């Protein structure tokens, strides 16, 4: 769970 703001920080 918990989708990040951006996949590739």
């Amino acid at each position: 769970p918990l989708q990040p703001q951006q996949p590739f920080p």
Partner: antibody, heavy 123, light 112 residues
């Protein structure tokens, strides 16, 4: 608006190498993470790699890890995909793309696609 | 396991409506997805994003007859007054930490 223009596709022997380029325009390139996506003939879209805005962090699908490397030049505003040890099953149309994720607001949350370039690995 | 589940094919009549379904795997019901359209032998075109509260973020020039919606773990794309040009493969797409994930795509046929 945003434009992503790819080049560098072609025919390569198995075990050979090839580098794809994606020339970006219409936005501050260095602000955004950039991705490569591919599509084998008659198959669906498959994620290949991502690279952070600064270039400090790279991410790869397991099927290409260790053979494909992504880099970027934030003055030429160009994204690259360096392929070594290419295999027959790497044959595909390769797309550069800009996926904005979330945290953005209006049109800044749009995604964009390059036009694709065909890479054929064959003897 | 972050997975997007799409039916392989769908069809509806010319001028009617169709809704395509994208299903998020358990534990990811809060995830944002995007819809991309790919006509046969063309490159993909981004359509919009769909989060839990529905919403959009339409690409430039995407008609109003394209809309999206959300309910639970399912994400929808609804196309009304179907035209021949709407025949295409529709991919939902999402992301997690350090990965992108694509559904298998839904190929839409507009009959008659």
């Amino acid at each position: 608006e945003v434009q992503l223009l790819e080049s560098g596709g072609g025919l390569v022997q198995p075990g050979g190498s090839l580098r794809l380029s994606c020339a970006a325009s219409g936005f501050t390139f260095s602000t955004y993470a950039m991705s490569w996506v591919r599509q084998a003939p008659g198959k669906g879209l498959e994620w290949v790699s991502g690279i952070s805005g600064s270039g400090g962090s790279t991410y790869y699908a397991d099927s290409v890890k260790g053979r494909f490397t992504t880099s970027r030049d934030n003055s030429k505003n160009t994204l690259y995909l360096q392929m070594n040890s290419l295999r027959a099953e790497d044959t595909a149309v390769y797309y550069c793309a800009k996926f904005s994720g979330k945290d953005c607001s209006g049109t800044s949350c749009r995604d964009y696609w390059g036009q694709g370039t065909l890479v054929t690995v064959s003897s | 396991q972050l997975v997007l589940t799409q039916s392989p094919s769908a069809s509806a009549s010319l001028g009617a409506s169709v809704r395509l379904t994208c299903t998020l795997s358990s534990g990811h019901s809060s995830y944002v997805i995007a819809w991309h359209q790919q006509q046969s032998e063309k490159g993909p075109r981004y359509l919009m994003k769909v989060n839990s509260d529905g919403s959009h973020s339409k690409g430039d020039g995407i008609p109003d007859r394209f809309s999206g919606s959300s309910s639970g773990a399912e994400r929808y794309l609804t196309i009304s007054s179907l035209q021949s040009e709407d025949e295409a493969d529709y991919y939902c797409q999402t992301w997690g930490a350090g990965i992108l994930v694509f559904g298998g795509g839904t190929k839409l046929t507009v009959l008659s």
